[PDB]
Amino acid sequence: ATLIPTGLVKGAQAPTPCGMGYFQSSAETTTCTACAVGTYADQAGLAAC
Amino acid sequence: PPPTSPPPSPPPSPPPPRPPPPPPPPPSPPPPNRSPPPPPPASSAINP
Ligand SMILES: *[C@H]1O[C@H](CO)[C@H](O)[C@H](O)[C@H]1O
Ligand SMILES: *[C@H]1O[C@H](CO)[C@H](O)[C@H](O)[C@H]1O
Ligand SMILES: *[C@H]1O[C@H](CO)[C@H](O)[C@H](O)[C@H]1O
Ligand SMILES: *[C@H]1O[C@H](CO)[C@H](O)[C@H](O)[C@H]1O
Ligand SMILES: *[C@H]1O[C@H](CO)[C@H](O)[C@H](O)[C@H]1O
Secondary structure, three states: OOOOOOOOOOOOOOOOOOOEEEOOHHHHOOOOEEOOOOOOOOOOOOOOO | OOOOOOOOOOOEEEOOOOOOOOOOOOOOOOOOOOOOOOOOOOOOOOOO
C-alpha cells in the first residue's frame, strides 16, 4: 500500500574458517564436514584434510 | 683226646656307610605372560 520496505537484516562481512578437525572442499557452502577415518585436519581453514 | 673244639663265631659285620642326599631342583619356570588390553572405542568428532 505505501510502497516502502521495512525489514532488512545484513549478512556476513567475513568468511568463517573451518575449525580444526573439519574441512570444506565446496566453494559456496554454509557448514564444515568432519573428515573421515585415516585423515586429519590440524589447521583452521583447510580445503581438504 | 679228640680234636679240641673251635672258637666262638664272630658277630655279624657292620653296614655300609649309607648314601648322600639328593641335589636340589632347578628354579621353577615363569608364569605365562599376560596379554595387553582392548583398544578403546572410536571417539566422536571434536567440537566445531
Ligand atoms: C667241640 O668240638 C670237638 C670236636 O668237634 C669235640 O667234639 C667237643 O666235644 C666239642 O665240644
Ligand atoms: C663260626 O666261627 C667259628 C670260628 O671261631 C667256628 O668256625 C664255628 O664253626 C662257626 O660257626
Ligand atoms: C665283619 O665284622 C665282624 C665282626 O663284627 C667279623 O669280624 C667279620 O669277619 C667281618 O667281616
Ligand atoms: C617349579 O619347578 C621346579 C623344577 O623346575 C620344581 O618342580 C618346583 O616344585 C616347581 O614349583
Ligand atoms: C595374550 O598375549 C600374551 C602375550 O603377552 C599371551 O600370548 C596370551 O596367550 C595371549 O592371550
